Structures are given as C-alpha cells and as structure tokens.
Design a protein around this nucleic acid. Sequence first.
RNA 1: GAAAUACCACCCUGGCGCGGCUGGGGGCCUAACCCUCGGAUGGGGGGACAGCGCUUGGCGGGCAGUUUGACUGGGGCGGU
Length: 76
Amino acid sequence: IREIKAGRIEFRNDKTGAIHAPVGKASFPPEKLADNIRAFIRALEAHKPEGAKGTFLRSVYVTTTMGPSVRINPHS
RNA sequence: GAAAUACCACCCUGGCGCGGCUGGGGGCCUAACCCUCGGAUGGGGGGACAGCGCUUGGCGGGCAGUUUGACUGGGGCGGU
C-alpha cells in the first residue's frame, strides 16, 4: 500500500491485449519520464507470459490524457 | 450500472475506401508446337492447348516376384 502512495502504477492487459500506466508527469523532467517509461518497460517485459510467439511488444507508446499520441521505441 | 459519459489514447466485431503480396476464372489472335494443303519451300485448320521432358498424387492383375504355420492314434474340415 506504501508504494501505492509513494509511486505505484500497475499492469493488466484489457480484453484485446493492451496495458496502460503512468510513466512520467507533464512538466516532469524529460530524463525522468524516460526512466519511468523504462521501469514499466522492464516489469512489463517480465510479465510477458511464455505464451507469446514472435512480435510480443507490438505497439508501445506514450500518449497523454487529452492530447498527443506517439509511439516510442523503448530500445533507445 | 456488470460499465459513464468531455475530449484525447490503444484494441477488437462488423462493411466499405486504397495500396504490396498471391489464390479462381471468361474472350480472336501467335510467331514456338501439332495436324497441315489438294497436284509448290507460300496458303490452310488447330495454338499456349496438347502433344512432349521431369517431379506430383491416384486408379490399377492386365502384368511381375513371394508367402497363405505346427500339433493331432492319415491328410483336411474339427479341436489347439
């Protein structure tokens, strides 16, 4: 519950195979948004069930609430 | 209410837009090919077909080459 308050963000693919989560604030340092995007990269990557065959992380992006929507290459 | 609603995200059920891949089929030719003409190496009919080469799957006695056991007061049929 502690992390629920200090920083949490969970995972849960919805009906069609997708997840959503907070990985950086708006006015928040760029490098930061980067790092969190990352921690998510990882835990997600881990969750990756062994039932995957091929292009698993199909579409990975950053989009806001009411705003822009652009994919990100969590590689670089 | 099992869900909440703005406007921005991804993902599907379903139909239409367009584009790269490739599956299905319907039309005279034509120059390879075949038959060709009818008295000439030029004309004629057919022509991308089937002839034919190879690889494919399948009918398939017409053919080939084997096999279709031992016991048991014969063999076999009967038993086993």
